[PDB]
Paper text:
Two glycosyltransferases (GTases), [name] and [name], are responsible for the glycosylation of [name] SDR proteins such as ClfA and ClfB. [name] first appends N-acetyl­glucosamine (GlcNAc) moieties onto serine residues (O-glycosylation) within the SDR domain using uridine diphos­phate N-acetylglucosamine ([name]-GlcNAc) as a donor substrate. The subsequent addition of GlcNAc to the glycoproteins is catalyzed by the second enzyme, [name], yielding glycosylated SDR proteins in which each SD repeat is decorated with GlcNAc disaccharide moieties. The glycosylation of SDR proteins mediated by [name] and [name] protects SDR proteins from degradation by host proteases, thereby circumventing innate immune attack.
Despite the biological significance of these two glycosyltransferases involved in pathogenicity and avoidance of the host innate immune response, their structures and the molecular basis of their activity have not been investigated. This study reports the crystal structures of [name] and [name] from [name] as well as multiple structures of [name] in complex with its substrates (for example [name], N-acetylglucosamine or SDR peptides), products (glycosylated SDR peptides) or phosphate ions. Interestingly, [name] undergoes a conformational change from an open to closed complex upon substrate binding. In addition to the dimerization role, the inserted domain was found to serve as a binding platform for the SD repeats before and after glycosylation. A long positive tract along the inserted domain stabilizes the binding of the glycosylated SD repeats to [name] by offsetting the negative charge clustered in the tandem SD repeats. [name] and [name] share the way that they recognize monoglycosylated SD repeats as a product and a substrate, respectively, but [name] is likely to preferentially bind a longer SDR substrate than a shorter one.
Residue numbers in the entry:
A (entry chain C), C (entry chain A): 0 to 499
B (entry chain G): 3 to 8
D (entry chain D): 1 to 8
The structure:
């Protein structure tokens, strides 16, 4: 009996929800229960993106499954440059400041090739052109080596249709697209499977078909990216058990618990609640709010998405002459990282040695860099990018900041406490209120009170005896979220969630 | 052309 | 060493040029020299059309070649209807007055299937539709069973690209199209062959690649459909020998030998004369006209495209009650068949038991029918359509008429003589005056002199003893075009044409 | 009718 956790994909940089799924696989692994991640969307880099966190046996990707590459490993690395010049007798012009080549034969421009790496061992894509230099086709290579998809283009490099191969070059899926409000949308899918040909109108229906091939009597599904996974489970028979896992606040205006509409990402889930065995949310308070709001139609339970282990890296080895503040947060607007650059702008007047290190990725990267540059803070505020392992960055961190206006839990908050780093955070739903006890492991601050935020941060900098105190309190709070107590809650859940 | 790459 | 007679395709009704090719294939067989016809254009009904005249080993088609379908025969028919209902659990809804079904999956519309026969043995095409009832793909089946080509459609059923399969379903060629003056034209072709990938800009370059793969040292090519084959041979190396064969007058206005431009269908050939080992025409006079015009740049030789056997079917079993005149010619303007209908109008008042039977097909058939009604000649002039065997129709024919203004030889003229049917023909370039000796086996008449036409045809009607004499002269002249006579010329030609 | 666009 297999436990399947169903999300969308794993990016090159892990999101919160993807980390929660990996956390859960590791907890099931340690208690001995079978679990696999299930990934729905086409991602020819998945095998690479998974490598730091899980093994090729711990996940099934739906396109891998129909493409006959599920559990397939990296290939013998193949030298495309040499094949094209030595075997094909093409001529290559390298493009400046890239891993790209233009490809000519017979005084014609044939192809544009883009590699992932500088040793040109990972071919990424190849564009093909006709006699007039229209880009008629794009070939997309899986990082394991095989050609994964060919996209046919119409008019202004618009996506008309895509073909998906097994590693031998047999076609296994076809997708046909139409543009609606400037974006391409699937209108038809053809899948060649089990010696038959199957027809679908969209990726939800293909999803549902995939789930039904995976399922054996006794398996259990967790629906973790609900804007895609719930529409899929809504098309599968009720005899397949599934649990809905919320990862964020559930309503649009969190201040109208009773009347605010459900977020768009959770609507299909809430509009078909009786399909689901239960809802799992991270925090106590969200349990109480969701159960009242759905009038107890199905069970609601709280299991934190994050846990603490004991740390085998240094903890609180501080540089005494400089203060290091940290933010572990996406470069995205609801994190409101601009407020922390403003906080630093004020603080440098009193702490000449202060630094703020912002670990993340996202869209606000440019605006935030331009804000730091407009204030001359380039020597005090660093956008460090995404690090896959933050362990050494916590070692000398004095404080963590959270200026977000909505959270489901905040894994970063629990990671900070587990590494001894007190946290100062706006008192927002959900997470901070349960993880921070003011004056014990940090401080809770009224949402968007930049004035109070400065005062409490400065007080802790002014008083390193406090910061030590809250650091011991931090390791204490984190111990309540131990690997062991989460296993207990998970094991009890899986033992009771099926009917008997 | 710059339309050659993506 | 193999001899290759390169045309373009084979239709339902055998044409002149196609019969010239098949005649030549039969002559090389009779003398023991290997010979095959080469067809260029994609035609998934070609194995049907050819079955009546040659065998499957007597020809190579280019698309069959790269689709690995050369020398493949029919499969035993697949019961698609039964596979769709019993194995796929689709629902079929017959389209009334058609061999067509609409195909549904549980009330969802997927496919429109058109069979060729009313027995549903020969699937012709299948259209695929998306969730909005767009026609995104058309599957075209070869009459032999397998799926030959899929066409991807965009906007208003415009062709965007085509994929061509071997009989196993592997893709072997890809064509990409752009629209120019409202018609699709090939802008790129990708061929998968000999484990490599080849790129072309148009069908002519693909043709030239095909000629190169066919060639083995000592082979000889004959270019018979020069509007397509000359451009192809212009892109092949001079080391591949090719003879150009003209089948019509060579210039747009035959009365201006020195000055008229070459017909469009020969331009590309005459502009690259030194590529060709020789030019072959059918008649003496055209040899001398052409060798002058090209200033003797390459050899010009005459070998008639037609030959006679002796006939085992009956000859000159005439009805003593009526006069049967015949015309054996396309219903096409240069044959000027309206003039023979005028002739009958004038003769019917003098010899009322007359009949004119016109065998052929073409665009003029409506004007010719309207002309017959205008004159009230429905009882006397019979548009008989195209008959694939004429032997019985010549048995009771008194006289054959030719009113054409332009011929290369006229296979129908020699065929008439060989059945002992004397001929009255305008004296035009090229053929009639080499095939008819006035007062021996017919009469020649100044071009478009319709009075002289009436006079001489009346003369032969008045003198059945003359018609008997001209009949026997016809069997005699036909002997000068015997199979043995033609073999003797082809053998000498093939022995001398290659270099040494 | 619109259903005639399904053929050819
Ligand atoms: O440089 C970084 C920045 C962030 N993270 C991780 O990204 C996740 C984000 O967690 P959170 O619950 O805060 O997710 P979010 O609220 O951003 O969706 C955390 O586990 C971080 O450890 C990381 O590994 N490296
Ligand atoms: O009902 C018909 C009419 C014509 N033909 C054939 O079509 C050919 C016409 O060739 P020809 O050179 O006479 O004229 P072209 O069409 O080449 O100008 C001849 O061989 C005829 O035997 C035929 O088989 N059946
Ligand atoms: C913006 C937001 O709410 N972030 C939540 C985060 O708090 C939570 O820890 C993570 C894993 O459950 O999922 C994210 O969606
Ligand atoms: C209209 C015309 O020119 N007809 C010729 C015909 O005389 C000749 O017998 C045949 C085969 O050579 O080719 C045709 O094109
Ligand atoms: C594609 O890449 C090249 C650099 O390798 C760049 O010049 C061009 O602008 C890029 N086009 C895009 C981003 O579409
Ligand atoms: C024909 O197709 C049209 C849509 O184009 C549809 O409305 C109609 O129901 C169809 N009729 C039949 C007979 O299938
Ligand atoms: C297509 O074929 C079907 C069946 O013969 C017919 O109902 C329909 O009108 C045709 N439409 C055309 C002319 O394309």
């Amino acid at each position: 009996a297999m436990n399947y956790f169903v999300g969308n994909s794993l990016g090159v940089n892990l999101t919160g929800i993807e980390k929660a799924i990996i956390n859960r696989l590791n907890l099931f692994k340690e208690m001995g229960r079978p679990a696999q991640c299930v990934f729905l969307s086409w991602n020819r880099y998945l095998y690479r993106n998974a490598q730091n966190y899980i093994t090729s046996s711990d996940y099934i990707n739906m396109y891998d499954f129909f493409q006959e590459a599920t559990y397939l490993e990296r290939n013998e690395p193949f030298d495309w440059l040499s094949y094209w010049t030595d075997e094909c007798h093409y001529t290559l012009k390298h493009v400046e400041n890239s891993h790209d080549f233009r490809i000519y034969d017979q005084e014609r421009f044939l192809m544009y090739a883009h590699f992932q790496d500088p040793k040109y061992r990972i071919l990424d894509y190849v564009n093909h052109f006709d006699s007039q230099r229209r880009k008629v086709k794009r070939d997309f290579y899986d990082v394991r080596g095989f050609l994964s998809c060919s996209r046919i283009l119409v008019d202004k490099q618009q996506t008309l249709c895509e073909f998906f191969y097994n590693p031998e070059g047999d076609t296994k899926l076809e997708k046909y697209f139409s543009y609606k409000d400037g974006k391409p949308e699937v209108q038809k899918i053809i899948v060649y499977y089990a010696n038959k040909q199957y027809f679908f109108n969209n990726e939800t229906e293909l999803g549902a078909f995939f789930i039904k091939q995976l399922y054996q009597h006794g398996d259990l599904f967790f629906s973790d990216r609900n804007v895609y996974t719930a529409p899929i489970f809504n098309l599968t028979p009720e005899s397949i058990p599934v649990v809905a896992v919320l990862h964020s606040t559930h309503i649009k205006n969190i201040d109208a618990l009773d009347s605010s509409p459900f977020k768009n990402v959770y609507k299909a889930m809430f509009e078909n609640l009786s399909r689901y065995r239960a809802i799992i949310v991270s925090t106590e308070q969200q349990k109480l709010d969701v159960e009242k709001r759905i009038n107890h139609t199905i069970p609601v339970v709280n299991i934190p998405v994050g846990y603490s282990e004991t740390i085998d890296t240094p903890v609180q080895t501080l540089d005494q002459r400089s203060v290091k503040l940290i933010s572990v947060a996406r470069y995205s607007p609801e994190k409101q990282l601009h407020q922390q650059i403003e906080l630093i702008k004020r603080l440098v007047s009193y702490v000449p040695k202060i630094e703020l290190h912002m670990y993340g990725f996202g869209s606000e990267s440019k605006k935030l860099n331009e804000l730091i540059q407009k204030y001359g803070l380039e020597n005090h505020v660093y956008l460090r990018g995404f690090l896959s392992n933050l362990d050494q960055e916590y070692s000398d961190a004095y404080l963590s900041l959270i200026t977000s206006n909505m959270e489901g839990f905040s894994l970063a908050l629990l990671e900070s406490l587990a590494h001894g780093v007190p946290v100062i955070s706006y008192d927002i739903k959900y997470g901070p209120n349960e993880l921070i006890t003011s004056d014990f492991n940090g401080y809770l601050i009224t949402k968007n009170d930049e004035d109070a935020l400065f005062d409490k941060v400065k007080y802790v900098i002014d008083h390193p005896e406090v910061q030590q105190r809250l650091s011991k309190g931090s390791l204490a709070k984190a111990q309540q979220y131990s690997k062991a107590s989460l296993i207990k809650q998970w094991d009890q859940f899986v033992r009771l969630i099926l009917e008997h | 052309s710059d339309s050659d790459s993506d």
